Amino acid sequence: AHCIGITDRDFIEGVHGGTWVSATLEQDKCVTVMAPDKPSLDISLETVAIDGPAEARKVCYNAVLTHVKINDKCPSTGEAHLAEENEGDNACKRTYSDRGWGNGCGLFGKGSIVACAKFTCAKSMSLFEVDQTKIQYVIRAQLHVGAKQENWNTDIKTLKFDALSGSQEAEFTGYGKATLECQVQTAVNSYIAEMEKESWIVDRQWAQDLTLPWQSGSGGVWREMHHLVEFEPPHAATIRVLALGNQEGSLKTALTGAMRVTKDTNDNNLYKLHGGHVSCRVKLSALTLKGTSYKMCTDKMSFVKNPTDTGHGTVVMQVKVPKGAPCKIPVIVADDLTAAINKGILVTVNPIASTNDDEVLIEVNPPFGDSYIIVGTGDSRLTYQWHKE
Amino acid sequence: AHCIGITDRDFIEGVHGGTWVSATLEQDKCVTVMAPDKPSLDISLETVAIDGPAEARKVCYNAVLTHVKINDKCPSTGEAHLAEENEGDNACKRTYSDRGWGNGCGLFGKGSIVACAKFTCAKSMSLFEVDQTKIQYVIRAQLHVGAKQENWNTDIKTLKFDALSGSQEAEFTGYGKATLECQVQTAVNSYIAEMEKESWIVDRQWAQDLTLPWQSGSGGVWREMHHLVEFEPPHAATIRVLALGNQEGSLKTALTGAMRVTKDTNDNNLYKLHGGHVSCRVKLSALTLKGTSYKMCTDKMSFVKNPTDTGHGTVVMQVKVPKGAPCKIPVIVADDLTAAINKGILVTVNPIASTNDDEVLIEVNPPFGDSYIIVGTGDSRLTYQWHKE
């Protein structure tokens, strides 16, 4: 029934003697499956997530340079050295400066000069390895029984899947069961990138080709520090060493193209992916209809919710049954008030009210142009003039 | 103007003294860019294709076995051999059969037996290497000038791009030029799969992991033939060797979840993709309006095409200008027939008729509720009552 709440909807129609149907589930899309003498089935792809992905890399986009050491030697006096050159947490550069009288050198020419700086990563981007098998995907399933919207969540059977989890059964008490054989499609060489609270799906080759300092799994060592370090041309005894600007903006700019990932609120290790699609095969032969034996409702009913357009070309209404329960709710969509031929298509197959004062939510597809929605019979019946554009 | 023909449309609005705007171009979607005193610009992603991709592999899904040779030797008489065992075009199997009196062997036990069959691939699937750089993407650009639909294709400037092709200029004679800095997003490693006329974008790892005979680039050798060959348990001197069924169905089934590729009709090497998106930055400051000097149309005009809803919340109409050309077409959307305050938003900025009997197509966004569409002035002006739901 939840497809009504969802903008993008598709109707799968089953042929009378068939047992299986095929459905493609995209995220933020819903599918209503209809089969003759079978209750209509709403199936939708909730989330496609990955739980506990191992961290492959870290990419510093904001670096801080501290304790800059510069050593120099007059021309023809040898190469200048620093102990930091041996220190792994230091980014260094060896070069020469113009020396002579004016900078305390007895000889005019190129004098040795070396600069080292302590590299500290202020802000880095995490890169996670996504295992195809560890991919978990959740599918919501529900029937068109006549439950009020406020109850939808409690009637929705949640089907949990992982890569090759096998067929999942959705058992509805009083309506039998439907079976789902789902396969997640690996169409969506990829890392899970994380910057602060924001997450994306990136290409591995692209991420490795980023001109930025990167750190291996478990860390302890920064490679390619020179990507965030700037050495200006040397003066006689000094070199201006500067940390490059925060590359957060450039990174985000490059990431604008990329698919985004919602990090789970409760769990710091769960990552809900968008974009992915699921190919499902549904067995309906095990589905049945409740209240087939029920006598038709003859008592005065009323519209709790007037017939309203769903935006799906269908109409929903909420009918109250104060008396006569348990009973079948007679619903047709005729050409006029005289004719008794149903021209409409009932999504809520065999609507029933098990108890008195029950409010049954009914969805129906009226024909094009002018028609009349008729609920029940006799003088007490409910009528509502309708027009389909 | 072509966005009108396209279902999914988006309106980009430029701020008065700004020069650049950002647009995201998805396939089967259009974007209308509007800037004050600038002609509205329709931009859309036509095709994202790859030209001349090198063939990496071939995957046989339908094999044919011919000329079956079987050699055998009685127990304790040595191993049985065939010349075909060294022939690369032959799939072979070595095993033993139960031998003794009844099959012409003086000894009861396991006798050597070997079977070879000429392997011929009836039908195979091609796999192409897709170069990120060789990716070409085409963008259609057009202005809202007032051209009839039948002429749209001739007014559309085609902007050809490839990975790092640089900014492309779209020059419209009499309306200046617009500039586009586009970047294709390499979210869509990957092979290009081909079966008969049908093509798809597949994952490399998935394709390599297929339990089927495969051939290298510049082929002449088939590897893993056993995937399509069946050797039945041996009889005394014979083995029933049979080719396995056409795996076309299984392949297509697996391919249902994958992105599809349209092979170009004219070119056998061009492959148009169905999934990528393009991030574009558009410069509009160089765009100008034609007929700013034109005097307003004062002659009796007529509606060739009555104002019609586009489904985009806008209205299109086709106005004939028999006399007065060259002239400005006065168009406003007022509260009534008396008021002269334009409450509507004109998509066709400064509509003009350069020649007599010109039929100008005009699009405008009327305000909500009741309004009046007014074209021209005087007693000969055109009026059309409108309502926005």
Numbering used by the authors:
A (entry chain B), B (entry chain A): 1 to 188, 192 to 392
Paper quotes:
Flaviviruses, which enter cells via receptor-mediated endocytosis, use protein E for this essential function. In infectious particles, E is primed to react to the mildly acidic pH of an endosome to undergo a fusogenic conformational change that drives the membrane fusion reaction.
In the absence of pr, YFV sE remains monomeric at neutral pH but crystallizes as a head-to-tail dimer, as observed at the surface of flavivirus mature particles. We used the protein eluting in peak 5 for crystallization of the E dimer. The sE dimer structure, determined by molecular replacement and refined to a free R factor of ~27%, showed the same head-to-tail dimer conformation observed in the previously reported structure of YFV 17D sE dimer in complex with the antigen-binding fragment of the monoclonal antibody A5 (23). The first interface involves an antiparallel interaction around helix αB, including inter-protomer hydrogen bonds, some of which involving main-chain/main-chain interactions. In the second interface, the fusion loop at the tip of DII packs against DI and DIII of the opposite protomer in the dimer for other flaviviruses. The side chain of the strictly conserved Trp101 of the fusion loop is covered by that of Lys308 of DIII, while the fusion loop main chain is partially tucked in between two short helices in DI, the N-terminal helical turn (N-helix in Fig. 6B) and a helix in the 150-loop (the 150-helix). Residues 149–155 form the 150-helix, highly exposed at the dimer surface. Superposition of DII of the YFV pr/sE complex on its counterpart on the sE dimer structure revealed a steric clash with the 150-helix, indicating that pr binding cannot take place with the 150-loop in the conformation observed in the sE dimer at neutral pH.
